[PDB]
Amino acid sequence: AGPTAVPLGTAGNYAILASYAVSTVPQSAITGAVGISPAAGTFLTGFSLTMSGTGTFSTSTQVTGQLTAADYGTPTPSILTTAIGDMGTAYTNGATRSGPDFLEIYTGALGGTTLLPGLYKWTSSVGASADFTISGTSTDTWIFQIDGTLGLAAGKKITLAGGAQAKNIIWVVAGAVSIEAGAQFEGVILAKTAVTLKTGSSLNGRILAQTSVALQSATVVQK
Ligand SMILES: [Mg+2]
């Protein structure tokens, strides 16, 4: 049940992929790669980077995986060029799906809901002032098309019931994304603009943002 997957291509090789900037207030806890392009590595801030012997990638105690930037040694820039392209294709693939299963459901106020599989369209912002559940099997899919902002209020949680998998939940979001302090998010974010995870928030999925990403001592576990 639910729509055909959004293929991330090589954007699925990153925990975080951004074009303008990635900032962390330590101590963030990122499982997977961090890439920035076309911006340079000086727009990776707060990571206390060490450049590794080849000059092609850097390391941080905040990241289990490699950081890469567009100014790094060959062939890193070509790799990120492809990843940024594949994120653009993924966003458009998700945003342009037609025939939604749910249209303006709950007016985009998702507190206390249980969301079954399908294609969701909101011509609005989406927020949640309370915990909500995504409920489906390990093979079901969700695509959440959001014309405005996406938020999850402080300390609130998305629960996966039934076997539902974060990698099968795509948030395709035109406006800014704000996960508030201590909130627990589930799914891949394909953001057209900025994504911010505030103090002690966590995301099981990926952050694939066409502008900036801001982390405040936040957890990103790639799914
Ligand atoms: Mg609500």
Author numbering: 1 to 223
Quote the paper:
Antifreeze proteins (AFPs) inhibit ice growth by adsorbing onto specific ice planes. To probe the molecular mechanisms responsible for AFP activity, we here characterized the antifreeze activity and crystal structure of TisAFP7 from the snow mold fungus Typhula ishikariensis. TisAFP7 exhibited intermediate activity, with the ability to bind the basal plane, compared with a hyperactive isoform TisAFP8 and a moderately active isoform TisAFP6. The structure is dominated by a right-handed β-helical domain, a typical DUF3494 structure.
The crystal structure of TisAFP7 T20Y was determined at 1.72 Å resolution. The crystal was isomorphous with the wild-type crystal, and the final structure was refined with R-factor of 0.208 and Free R of 0.246, containing 446 residues and 554 solvent molecules. Indeed, both substitutions resulted in a reduced TH activity (0.4 °C at 0.25 mM T20Y mutant and 0.45 °C at 0.27 mM A214Y mutant), equivalent to a 60% and 50% reduction from wild-type TisAFP7, accordingly. Panels 1 and 2, the T20Y mutant covered only the perimeter zone of the hemisphere, corresponding to the secondary prism planes. The reduced coverage of ice planes by the T20Y mutant indicated lost ice-binding affinity for the basal, primary prism, and some pyramidal planes. The water network of TisAFP7 was less extensive than that of TisAFP8. This prompted us to propose that the antifreeze activity of TisAFPs, typically reflecting the affinity toward the ice basal plane, is correlated with the water coverage on IBS via the extended network of water molecules, as observed in the current study. In the mutant, the bound water molecules near residue 20 were removed by introducing the side chain of Tyr, thus truncating the zigzag pattern.
